[PDB]
Scaffold this active site. Sequence first.
Site, PDB file in Angstrom:
ATOM      1  N   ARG A  82      24.234  15.070  24.636  1.00 16.22           N
ATOM      2  CA  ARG A  82      24.417  15.773  23.327  1.00 16.22           C
ATOM      3  C   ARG A  82      25.268  16.819  23.564  1.00 16.22           C
ATOM      4  O   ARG A  82      25.196  17.698  24.446  1.00 16.22           O
ATOM      5  CB  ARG A  82      23.027  16.467  22.883  1.00 16.22           C
ATOM      6  CG  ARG A  82      23.014  17.242  21.618  1.00 16.22           C
ATOM      7  CD  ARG A  82      23.236  16.628  20.374  1.00 16.22           C
ATOM      8  NE  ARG A  82      23.072  17.491  19.217  1.00 16.22           N
ATOM      9  CZ  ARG A  82      22.066  17.526  18.269  1.00 16.22           C
ATOM     10  NH1 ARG A  82      20.810  17.532  18.881  1.00 16.22           N
ATOM     11  NH2 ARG A  82      22.225  18.184  17.254  1.00 16.22           N
ATOM     12  N   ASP A  95      17.962  14.245  19.662  1.00 14.07           N
ATOM     13  CA  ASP A  95      17.760  15.741  18.996  1.00 14.07           C
ATOM     14  C   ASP A  95      16.543  15.987  18.949  1.00 14.07           C
ATOM     15  O   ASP A  95      15.414  15.147  18.731  1.00 14.07           O
ATOM     16  CB  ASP A  95      18.269  15.492  17.308  1.00 14.07           C
ATOM     17  CG  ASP A  95      18.065  16.665  16.679  1.00 14.07           C
ATOM     18  OD1 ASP A  95      18.407  17.853  17.359  1.00 14.07           O
ATOM     19  OD2 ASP A  95      17.368  16.903  15.638  1.00 14.07           O
ATOM     20  N   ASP A  97      13.688  19.052  17.998  1.00 12.39           N
ATOM     21  CA  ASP A  97      13.298  20.041  17.293  1.00 12.39           C
ATOM     22  C   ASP A  97      11.990  20.565  17.524  1.00 12.39           C
ATOM     23  O   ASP A  97      11.091  19.800  17.536  1.00 12.39           O
ATOM     24  CB  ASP A  97      13.476  19.674  15.771  1.00 12.39           C
ATOM     25  CG  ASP A  97      14.937  19.490  15.345  1.00 12.39           C
ATOM     26  OD1 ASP A  97      15.774  19.745  16.306  1.00 12.39           O
ATOM     27  OD2 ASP A  97      15.442  19.638  14.246  1.00 12.39           O
TER      28      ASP A  97
HETATM   29  N1  ATP Z   1      13.087  25.140  15.499  1.00 13.13           N
HETATM   30  C1  ATP Z   1      13.900  24.836  16.089  1.00 13.13           C
HETATM   31  N2  ATP Z   1      14.062  23.709  17.138  1.00 13.13           N
HETATM   32  C2  ATP Z   1      15.388  23.497  17.571  1.00 13.13           C
HETATM   33  N3  ATP Z   1      16.458  24.181  17.665  1.00 13.13           N
HETATM   34  C3  ATP Z   1      16.277  25.275  16.887  1.00 13.13           C
HETATM   35  C4  ATP Z   1      15.147  25.627  16.204  1.00 13.13           C
HETATM   36  N4  ATP Z   1      15.321  26.830  15.486  1.00 13.13           N
HETATM   37  C5  ATP Z   1      16.618  27.036  15.706  1.00 13.13           C
HETATM   38  N5  ATP Z   1      17.042  26.152  16.497  1.00 13.13           N
HETATM   39  C6  ATP Z   1      18.416  26.373  16.915  1.00 13.13           C
HETATM   40  O1  ATP Z   1      19.637  25.498  16.335  1.00 13.13           O
HETATM   41  C7  ATP Z   1      20.307  24.949  17.098  1.00 13.13           C
HETATM   42  C8  ATP Z   1      20.571  23.735  17.384  1.00 13.13           C
HETATM   43  O2  ATP Z   1      20.541  22.887  16.240  1.00 13.13           O
HETATM   44  P1  ATP Z   1      21.060  21.504  16.260  1.00 13.13           P
HETATM   45  O3  ATP Z   1      22.609  21.461  16.654  1.00 13.13           O
HETATM   46  O4  ATP Z   1      20.411  20.557  17.047  1.00 13.13           O
HETATM   47  O5  ATP Z   1      21.046  21.189  14.864  1.00 13.13           O
HETATM   48  P2  ATP Z   1      20.407  19.909  13.925  1.00 13.13           P
HETATM   49  O6  ATP Z   1      18.965  19.565  14.578  1.00 13.13           O
HETATM   50  O7  ATP Z   1      21.483  18.674  14.223  1.00 13.13           O
HETATM   51  O8  ATP Z   1      20.278  20.384  12.688  1.00 13.13           O
HETATM   52  P3  ATP Z   1      18.928  21.075  11.825  1.00 13.13           P
HETATM   53  O9  ATP Z   1      18.551  22.141  12.757  1.00 13.13           O
HETATM   54  O10 ATP Z   1      19.321  21.305  10.732  1.00 13.13           O
HETATM   55  O11 ATP Z   1      17.702  20.053  11.826  1.00 13.13           O
HETATM   56  C9  ATP Z   1      20.365  25.891  18.528  1.00 13.13           C
HETATM   57  O12 ATP Z   1      21.147  27.198  18.386  1.00 13.13           O
HETATM   58  C10 ATP Z   1      18.946  26.288  18.543  1.00 13.13           C
HETATM   59  O13 ATP Z   1      18.761  27.708  19.081  1.00 13.13           O
HETATM   60  C1  87Y Z   2      21.761  14.534  10.235  1.00 19.32           C
HETATM   61  C2  87Y Z   2      20.397  14.956   9.595  1.00 19.32           C
HETATM   62  C3  87Y Z   2      20.939  16.301   8.729  1.00 19.32           C
HETATM   63  C4  87Y Z   2      19.602  16.733   7.996  1.00 19.32           C
HETATM   64  C5  87Y Z   2      20.008  17.266   6.645  1.00 19.32           C
HETATM   65  C6  87Y Z   2      19.526  16.981   5.568  1.00 19.32           C
HETATM   66  C7  87Y Z   2      19.947  17.786   4.506  1.00 19.32           C
HETATM   67  C8  87Y Z   2      20.910  18.864   4.211  1.00 19.32           C
HETATM   68  C9  87Y Z   2      21.280  19.215   5.488  1.00 19.32           C
HETATM   69  C10 87Y Z   2      20.832  18.536   6.700  1.00 19.32           C
HETATM   70  N1  87Y Z   2      20.238  13.788   8.950  1.00 19.32           N
HETATM   71  C11 87Y Z   2      19.020  13.248   9.515  1.00 19.32           C
HETATM   72  N2  87Y Z   2      18.545  12.116   9.073  1.00 19.32           N
HETATM   73  C12 87Y Z   2      17.526  11.365   9.423  1.00 19.32           C
HETATM   74  N3  87Y Z   2      16.869  10.113   8.974  1.00 19.32           N
HETATM   75  N4  87Y Z   2      16.843  11.643  10.669  1.00 19.32           N
HETATM   76  C13 87Y Z   2      17.369  12.695  11.472  1.00 19.32           C
HETATM   77  O1  87Y Z   2      16.661  12.888  12.399  1.00 19.32           O
HETATM   78  C14 87Y Z   2      18.289  13.512  10.678  1.00 19.32           C
HETATM   79  N5  87Y Z   2      18.585  14.822  11.305  1.00 19.32           N
HETATM   80  C15 87Y Z   2      19.637  15.566  10.758  1.00 19.32           C
HETATM   81  C16 87Y Z   2      20.132  16.422  11.401  1.00 19.32           C
HETATM   82  O2  87Y Z   2      19.088  17.126  12.107  1.00 19.32           O
HETATM   83 MG    MG Z   3      18.127  20.260  16.700  1.00 16.21          MG
HETATM   84 MG    MG Z   4      17.280  18.307  13.688  1.00 19.21          MG
END
Ligand code: ATP
Ligand code: 87Y
Ligand code: MG
Ligand code: MG
Length: 158
Positions: A82, A95, A97
């Site tokens: 990543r 990913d 979370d």
């Molecule tokens: N609950 C959480 N789980 C994981 N990372 C988190 C969380 N809350 C905040 N973060 C922060 O989010 C950033 C990483 O986010 P990441 O690049 O993986 O976004 P994403 O998962 O692709 O998108 P999204 O967060 O919208 O689902 C890091 O700066 C991490 O500190």
């Molecule tokens: C890339 C996004 C964006 C999530 C997002 C949706 C709407 C507005 C902002 C971000 N889409 C994903 N889709 C699936 N099926 N599955 C995912 O795990 C997923 N994760 C996301 C980012 O964490």
């Molecule tokens: Mg994440």
């Molecule tokens: Mg995510």
Amino acid sequence: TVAYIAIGSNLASPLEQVNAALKALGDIPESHILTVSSFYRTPPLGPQDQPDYLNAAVALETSLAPEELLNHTQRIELQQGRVRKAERWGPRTLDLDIMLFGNEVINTERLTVPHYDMKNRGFMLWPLFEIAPELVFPDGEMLRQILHTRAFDKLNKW
Ligand SMILES: Nc1ncnc2c1ncn2[C@@H]1O[C@H](COP(=O)(O)OP(=O)(O)OP(=O)(O)O)[C@@H](O)[C@H]1O
Ligand SMILES: C[C@@]1(CCc2ccccc2)Nc2nc(N)[nH]c(=O)c2N=C1CO
Ligand SMILES: [Mg+2]
Ligand SMILES: [Mg+2]
């Protein structure tokens, strides 16, 4: 504490990525996996120009602090290739979370728990529901109610 982790992957053989991630999650110190959901195949939400995702949820019992758990989930992401940039919602090998951490409400620059958008994402809520159908959020909302109310489409399996 019981933490719920969401898993997503849409690059470099998602099934291999997720099976490897499950092994590494089991290797985190002071932690052990309780349950794993089924593996779902979901169309991308957000940017549509990327492959379909493999999404799953895991229940982990841990005595690590929330930010220490984050250090390990980020290490696993990095280990599996990543590379993040400020431009966020593109394809990724792995990913991890933190959706929920016990009943804690956390709002820091590194960690926002419950996950800030999970109530809007069927790919997080359905897998979670499969392993914890009677889950209640820290704010009192019931997971079962959120799904029944919003009418999220059901997911296909990988
Ligand atoms: N609950 C959480 N789980 C994981 N990372 C988190 C969380 N809350 C905040 N973060 C922060 O989010 C950033 C990483 O986010 P990441 O690049 O993986 O976004 P994403 O998962 O692709 O998108 P999204 O967060 O919208 O689902 C890091 O700066 C991490 O500190
Ligand atoms: C890339 C996004 C964006 C999530 C997002 C949706 C709407 C507005 C902002 C971000 N889409 C994903 N889709 C699936 N099926 N599955 C995912 O795990 C997923 N994760 C996301 C980012 O964490
Ligand atoms: Mg994440
Ligand atoms: Mg995510």
